[PDB]
From a paper:
[name] ([name]) is an evolutionary conserved protein implicated in many biological processes; however, its primary molecular function remains unknown. We conclude that [name] is an iron-binding protein that modulates iron homeostasis in cancer cells.
To prevent metal oxidation, [name] crystallization with iron (II) or copper (I) was set up in an anaerobic chamber and the plates were incubated under argon, while the crystals were growing. When [name] was crystallized in the presence of copper, the copper atom bound at the same site, and was coordinated by the same residues as iron. The protein fold of both metal-bound forms of [name] is essentially identical to the metal-free structure, with RMSD for α-carbons of the superimposed structures being less than 0.17 Å. In the absence of iron, we have also observed binding of copper (added as Cu(I)) to [name] at a molar ratio of copper to protein of approximately 0.4. Therefore, in the absence of specific copper loading mechanisms for [name], it is likely to predominantly bind iron in the cytosol of the living cells, even though copper binding can be observed in vitro. Still, consistent with the previous reports, [name] may bind copper under oxidative conditions in a specific local environment within the cell, and it is tempting to speculate that metal-binding change may trigger a switch between different [name] activities in the cell.
Residue numbers in the entry: 5 to 297
């Protein structure tokens, strides 16, 4: 058709509009805005019942009176993708209100030939982008009729491809009217994820997970894509949105080469549970914001 349905409403977040509106409002109430206006954010894409309050720390930094085009870069979980993919529909539906895809930017991005066209089934099967639509619509409701979205599915990008896509999106990141939402959870720890790296010097397992995550968070705060690449090559932390992050980090360094000065700061860290023994498992969530100066 012409609309991507809220395919994960009911399961990953409440399908009731009034209830969803109230939940996001409540999570956003407990956050004080400190990084307005955010040029980019990093936010988790798990179920709202796990990461809702954490993701609110990122969306409170969005200034709806400034932002007009919202890029959402999410990792692919079901489709083999070596590049980036664009949607084939024109509207993304949410229980709050439906979001419009910026046709001008979609034509510019498609005309590069670096992007693939993802089918409607692939679109609705994926959740890494959709989990940010209700939060985006809520934070932008004061200007609900003046903003568009640019969905981008990010595949298994090579380091060179992360740099190429980063330089491409850098021209859009430099626009003050643009916002880049980078979707990622952090450490998936446990036997279910086949990842059990544990540094006993850090104490308990959940403290080792915390130290491992915040090492990667600090590198992001240093805006260093090469150090982030090495950190992933050294510890193999199960950060599922590492490719969108690497794309953003390269976009920042391309802007730094052109005189622009920026600062990224993480604002909330959380874990779905606190692992203490080898039979435990947890997923970490981190919310951060990028500000341009
Ligand atoms: Cu994930």
């Amino acid at each position: 058709v012409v609309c991507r349905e809220a395919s994960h409403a009911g399961s990953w977040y409440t399908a009731s509009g009034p209830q969803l509106n109230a939940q996001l409002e409540g999570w956003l109430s407990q956050v004080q805005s400190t990084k307005r206006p955010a040029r980019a954010i990093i936010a988790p894409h798990a179920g709202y019942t796990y990461c809702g309050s954490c993701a609110a720390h990122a969306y409170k930094q969005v200034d709806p009176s400034i932002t007009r085009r919202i890029f959402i870069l999410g990792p692919s979980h079901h489709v083999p993708l070596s590049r980036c993919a664009l949607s084939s529909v024109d509207i993304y539906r949410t229980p709050l209100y439906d979001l419009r895809i910026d046709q001008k930017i979609y034509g510019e991005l498609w005309k590069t030939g670096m992007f693939e066209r993802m089918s409607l089934q692939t679109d609705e099967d994926e959740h890494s982008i959709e989990m940010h639509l209700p939060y985006t619509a809520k934070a932008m409701e004061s200007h609900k009729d003046e903003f568009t979205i640019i969905p981008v599915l990010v595949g298994a990008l090579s380091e060179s491809k992360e740099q190429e896509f980063g330089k491409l999106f850098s021209k859009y990141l430099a626009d003050p009217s643009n916002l880049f939402v980078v979707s990622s959870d952090f450490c998936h720890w446990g036997q279910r994820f086949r990842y059990s790296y544990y540094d006993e010097s850090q104490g308990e397992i959940y403290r080792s997970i915390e130290h491992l995550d915040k090492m990667g968070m600090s590198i992001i705060e240093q805006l260093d894509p090469v150090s982030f690449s090495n950190y992933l090559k050294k510890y193999h932390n199960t950060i599922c949105g590492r490719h969108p992050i690497g794309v953003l980090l390269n976009a920042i360094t391309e802007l730094q080469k052109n005189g622009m000065n920026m600062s990224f700061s993480f604002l909330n860290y959380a874990q779905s549970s606190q692992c203490r023994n080898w039979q435990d498992s947890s997923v970490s969530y981190a919310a951060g914001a990028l500000t341009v100066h």
